[PDB]
Amino acid sequence: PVYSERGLKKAVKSDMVSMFKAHLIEHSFFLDKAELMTRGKQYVLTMLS
Amino acid sequence: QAENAARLGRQVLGLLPPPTHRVSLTRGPEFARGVRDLLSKYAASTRPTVGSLHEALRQAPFRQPTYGDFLVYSQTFSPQEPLGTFLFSFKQEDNGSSMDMLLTPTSLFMLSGMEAAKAPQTHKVAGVWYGSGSGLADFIPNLSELMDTGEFHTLLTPVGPMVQSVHSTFVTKVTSAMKGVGLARDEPRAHVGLTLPCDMLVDLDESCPMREPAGLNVTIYASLVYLRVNQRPSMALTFFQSGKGFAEVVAMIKDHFTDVIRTKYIQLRHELYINRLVFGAVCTLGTVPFDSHPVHQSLNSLPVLVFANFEAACGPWTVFL
Amino acid sequence: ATLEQRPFPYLATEANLLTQIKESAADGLFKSFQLLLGKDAREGSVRF
Amino acid sequence: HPGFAMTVVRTDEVLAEHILYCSRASTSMFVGLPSVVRREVRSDAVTFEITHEIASLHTALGYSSVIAPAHVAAITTDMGVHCQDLFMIFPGDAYQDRQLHDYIKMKAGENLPGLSHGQLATCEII
Amino acid sequence: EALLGVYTNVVEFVKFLETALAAACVNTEFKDLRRMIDGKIQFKISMPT
Amino acid sequence: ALDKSIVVNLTSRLFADELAALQSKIGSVLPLGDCHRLQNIQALGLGCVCSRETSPDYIQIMQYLSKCTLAVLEEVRPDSLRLTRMDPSDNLQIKNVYAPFFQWDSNTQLAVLPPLFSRKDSTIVLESNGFDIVFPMVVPQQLGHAILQQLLVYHIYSKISALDLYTTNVSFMGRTYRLDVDNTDPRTALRVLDDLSMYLCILSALVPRGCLRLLTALVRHDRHPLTEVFEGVVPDEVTRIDLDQLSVPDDITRMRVMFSYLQSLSSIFNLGPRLHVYAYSAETLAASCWYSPR
Amino acid sequence: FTEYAGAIKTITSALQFGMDALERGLVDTVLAVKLRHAPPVFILKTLGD
Amino acid sequence: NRGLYTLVNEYSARLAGAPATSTTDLQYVVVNGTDVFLDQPCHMLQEAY
Amino acid sequence: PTPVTSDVAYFQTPSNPRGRAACVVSCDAYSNESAERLLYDHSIPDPAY
C-alpha cells in the first residue's frame, strides 16, 4: 500500500506498470535462475517468502 | 378501548409548541434552570454512551412548515406525479367558491408552445400526460393576449413542492408545502424533497476551476421568458441554481439568454409596441443548503433530479432585461 | 443474487477488511458494492 | 551546431522509507478534556463535533530525534528529457511581427493522454 | 436462494498510552488546558572551568 | 440549539506589534471562506481577492463579499484567533471600531462595503505569517449607496480621458471624503456600466410625454429648492419631444413599464448583506442587530 | 423494539467512531511534533563529534 | 546566511522555497502544503549531481 | 516493412514493432477517445521517446 496511498492516478499506474515489466524479466523462473547463483538458498527463500 | 385513547393523550401533549418562559419572581433563580436549549456544549467522557447524551439529543429546534390545501380539477393535475414536483397557482378571477388551478412545470411546458429541441426530453413526457395542449388552454382563453402585454408572470404565485395528492375521478385534492421541509405522509418520519426535471434546470456554478467561497446557502431561482416563435407568442420557463447572490445572477441570466434577446429585438426596428418591451421575470423559490448532491432519478424515461433538505421561501417577480 | 440494505444482525470478525478499499472499490476489485456517507450509514427501516 | 553550448538541470524524486529514532522522555505532553459541540442542524441530519486540545513542550535542549533515508521504494520522476516550455511561463512577451511569432511557435509547440515510463520531468537550458 | 454469511469489520481502538511511541514522551493529564495561555520551562546551566 | 464559533489555528506565535492592532479592533466584521470550526489564516483576510501586487477592482471585491459568510471577532490570543459567526437570521452584538468614523443610533440601517478610503489604514500586514488581513468597512445605507454612486461615475469619466475633485469626492452632510483609486482594474466595474447602458436607453424610449410637459411648465418660472440642477434653463431635448398631443391611455401603459424597469435597477445597485440595527448603545459603541443575507 | 434497539446501535457506533478517531489524533500529532524536530543523519552526525 | 544551528532547526520544520508537485503529470509547483512530505537536500548543500 | 534509417537502439529495449507504445493501462479509465491519442495521434511524441 506504499504505492497506492495517493490513489491510482495516471502517474502512479505508469510507475506500477513499469514494475510489472521489471519483475517479469529480473525475477522469473527463480528456481532456474538460482541454479547458477552464488547465493542459492538465500535467493530462493527471499523469493518464496 | 381507552388504551387507544391513551395514545392520543401521549402524542398530543408531547407534541405542542414550547410554552412561554414565565416564572414568578417569588420562586427565585429557578428560571435559570429552565433554560436548556440555549446550552450548546455538552460534556464528553472517555467512553460516552447514549445514556450519557440522551439529554443532548433531546433539545431540538422548533421547525414546522405551513401547508397549502388546493382543490383541483383532475384534468389539469395529471393523476400520476412524482410527489415532489414544484407548483404554481395561476389566478385570473374568483368564479366559484373553491376550484383552484395548479401548474406543474411539465404542465406549463404545454401551455407555452415552445419547440421540441429546446427541451428535448420532457416534450415526450408532457405529451403523454396531456393532449395536444388545448385540454388546458380552454381554461385560459387569454393565452394569446396574456403573452402580448406580458401579464402572465404577474398571475403566478409560486407555492412549493407537493406533499400528498388524494385523487378522485373528477377532482384531485393537492396538499403543497410552503415555509420549509414538508413532512412526508405515507412514509412516516420522512421528508419530502423537491424534484425538478434535469431538462428545465440550468446549473449556474460550474468551473474547471481554472476559487469560489463555500457557504451555507444556495438558492433555486425560477425564470419565465417572453418570446415569439413562428410569429406567435410563447413563453419559456427555466430554472437556475447558484449561491452567488442576487447582484451577480441577474448578470449571469442575461448571458444565458443572449441569443434569445438578439432574435427578438431585430423585429422591433420596424414596429415598436410598448407592451412588447417587457421580457422576463425572476422569482426566488427558496434555499438549498450547501454541498447537498442532487440525486439523479429516472421515471417513465424521464431523468429527474431531487433536492433533499429543500426549504421553500417564495419571492416576487422582478422584471429583468 | 442481489444486494440489499436490510438491517441484518451482522457478525463481527477478527480480521481487518480495510487495507486498500479506497482504490480497490473505485477501480472495481469486486462488483456490486455501495458506499454510504454520513447520515446514510445506518440500519434504516423494516417494511414487509 | 549553433554558436553556443548549454547545460541542463533536472530534478528527481524518490519514494523512500524512513527510520525515525527518538530518545526517551524528550517531550512533555499535556492532554485536555474532549467536548461535544452541536451545530449545522438541518432537517435530514444533525452534525456534531468532538474537539480536543494538546500542549507539547520540548523537554531538553539537544536534538532528541533523528530521521534517516533507509530504503528506496520507487523513482517517480522518470528522469525524462522533456524540456520546459518558456512559452507557457511568459505568454505576454512576443515578437514584433505577429505573423512571424505565430511561425516560430508552430516549429516548437493536457496534450499527453497517457505516459508510459513515468511522471514526466522538465529540464532547463543555461 | 440462501444467505450464507453476514460479516462485518470491528475496528479495535489502539490507545496512545499503550503504543510504544509513548516511551519517547511524558504523558500528563491536564484538566483545563483551554485556560492556559503559555507554558514555560526555564534552565540554569553552570559551567566549570 | 445551534452553536457558532470559529477558532483559527495559526502556525507561528504573533509579535507584540501585530497583536496590538488586533487587540484594538476586538469587535469587527470580516468575512471568511469556509464554515468550520478549525480554519487556516489564508481564508480570514479579504486579501485573497484584494492584494498589493494584483490591481484590485472594488466591484469584484464587493461582488465577492455577498458570497462569503461573515464573522465577528471575540478574542485575540497570541497563538489562535477566535471568532464568532453570523448566520440567518440571528441577533448579535456588533461594535464599530471602523476608522473613518460615523455616528449610529437606535433603529439605524447598515451594510458591509470594501475598504474604499484608506487601505493602508484598514489593512494590517502580518510579517510573521506572510499573509496580510484586509478588513471590510460597515457603512449605513445612505452613505452605503453614495459611495457606490460615485465609483460608477468615476469609471465613466476615466474612460473619456483616454479632473479629480468632481469624480473622486463622495459628498455628505458636514464632511467630504476621498475615494482610494490609484490602481483599479476597470473591467469588472464596466460590465456593471455595460448593463446600465442597457436599462437607461430603454427608459429613454418609454418616457411619458405629460411628465416632460410638467417640466416645461415648472423649471421656467416656478423655481423649487430641489430643481436647481437645471439652473433655470430648459434642456434642448425636452422641447423637441413634447410636440405631440397628450392622451391619458397612452401614458398608463407607459408608466407601468416605467415602474417595472425601476424594479430591475435594484439588481444592479445592490449592496452586500444588510444589517437592521434595532438597538445601539452610544458610549459603549456596541449594538444589537439581526443579519439578513440578500 | 427491534427498530428502536437497532437505532441505538447505530448512534453508539457513530459515536464510538468519534472518540476512536480522536485517539488517532494523539498518535498523529505526537508523531508530527517529532518529525518537525528530527534533522537527518548527515547533518547531525558531524555535529555530534 | 545565518548560523548553522538555526539552519538545522529550519531544515525539518520549514518547507523551503519553490518546491515541486508529486503524483501529477508534469512538474508543477505545489502551493497546498497540507500534505506534501518532501525533503530536499539541495539548498543547504547548494549542489547539483 | 520499415525504413532503412530506423534506429538499432529501438530493437534492444523491449517495445512493440509499431514504433509507438500501446500501453493503455496508464491512461484514464473508460476514456476511449483519450486512449486513441496514444496509439495513433502524432501531434504528441510517443510515450517511449
Automatic annotation (TrEMBL), chain D:
Name of the featured protein: ORF25
Organism of provenance: Human herpesvirus 8
Taxonomic lineage: Viruses, Duplodnaviria, Heunggongvirae, Peploviricota, Herviviricetes
TrEMBL record, chain E:
Signal sequence coordinates: none
Superkingdom, taxonomy of origin: Viruses
Protein's UniProt name: ORF25
Organism name: Human herpesvirus 8
Gene name tied to this protein: ORF25
Residues of the full protein shown: 51 to 99 of 1376
Automatic annotation (TrEMBL), chain F:
Gene Ontology molecular function, alphabetical: structural molecule activity
Superkingdom of origin organism: Viruses
Record's GO cellular component terms: viral capsid
Name listed for the protein in its UniProt record: ORF26
Transmembrane stretches, start-end: none
Pfam family, one: Herpes_V23
Keyword terms of this UniProt record: Capsid protein, Host nucleus, Virion
UniProt-listed InterPro entries: Herpes_capsid_2
From TrEMBL, chain I:
The protein, known as: ORF25
Full protein: residues contained: 1181 to 1229 of 1376
Highest taxon of the lineage: Viruses
Organism in which the protein naturally occurs: Human herpesvirus 8 (HHV-8)
